[PDB]
Amino acid sequence: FVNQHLCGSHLVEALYLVCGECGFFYTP
């Protein structure tokens, strides 16, 4: 689903800013 695909792109950017030096895991 493309709508999910577009949402996920914004999610990973938010995780990048929120998590800082910790980094994050993105698991769809």
- Quote the least distance from Cβ 22 to another protein, whole Å: 4
What is the footprint of a copy of itself within residues 1-28 (CB under 8 A)? 2-3, 5-10, 12-21, 23-28
Are 28 and 10 in contact by the 8 Å Cβ rule? The answer is no
How many whole angstroms separate alpha carbon 28 and alpha carbon 26? 6
- Quote the least distance from Cβ 2 to a copy of itself, whole Å: 5
Residues contributing to the site for Cl ion (CB under 5 A) = 6
Residues contributing to the site for a copy of itself (CB under 8 A) = 2-3, 5-10, 12-21, 23-28
